[PDB]
């Protein structure tokens, strides 16, 4: 019942519209389109996979303005972001140009989608290390000093203590 995307588009008709959703695996599926109040169309998809999905929306075979759109899915209402924990120096303080490292423990949440975002005065390079011990290593490097926000989400819900505010100094 969540409208994964809504589009207000005048003087089209639903029977000539198509909404094709591509999942992260590359699988495509046809989304359900329903017309709400106004000419506001609700596009709904029941996802089998977590992560950002793409939707192409066409009227009479032509992309609408904005297409392709994307949307993210989750959470599922079953737990579970609250069972993930993250910690380490890279969530406390860092230095510009120097890998800021931390771990994420995801084993209690089980299967899903883990998103790591870093926001601030430069673009982060992010590294992921799968470990066979139930934990993930993450590292990021940012070029510019400043306050960064580091977000860790499971199925698009922030885990405990996310977002982390991280002061990044010039190296010393």
């Amino acid at each position: 019942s969540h409208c994964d995307l809504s589009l207000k588009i005048p003087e089209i008709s639903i029977q000539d519209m198509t909404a094709q959703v591509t999942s992260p695996s590359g699988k495509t599926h046809e989304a359900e389109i329903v017309e709400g109040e106004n000419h506001t169309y609700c596009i709904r998809f029941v996802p089998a996979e977590m992560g950002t999905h793409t939707v192409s929306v066409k009227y009479k075979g032509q992309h609408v303005p904005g297409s392709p759109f994307q949307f993210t899915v989750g959470p599922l209402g079953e737990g579970g972001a609250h069972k993930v924990r993250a910690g380490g120096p890279g969530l406390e303080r860092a230095e510009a140009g120097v890998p800021a490292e931390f771990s994420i423990w995801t084993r209690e949440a089980g299967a899903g989608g883990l998103a790591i975002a870093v926001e601030g005065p430069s673009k982060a390079e992010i590294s992921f290390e799968d470990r066979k011990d139930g934990s993930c290593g993450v590292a990021y490097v940012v070029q510019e000093p400043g306050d960064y926000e580091v977000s860790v989400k499971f199925n698009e819900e922030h885990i405990p203590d996310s977002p982390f505010v991280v002061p990044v100094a010039s190296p010393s």
């Binding site: 992260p24 977590m50 089980g110």
Partner: peptide, 15 residues
């Protein structure tokens, strides 16, 4: 004071 986003997603498998 410019602010940019960088984000990565990981598919987590059943344990």
């Amino acid at each position: 004071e410019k602010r940019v986003a960088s984000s990565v997603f990981i598919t987590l498998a059943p344990p």
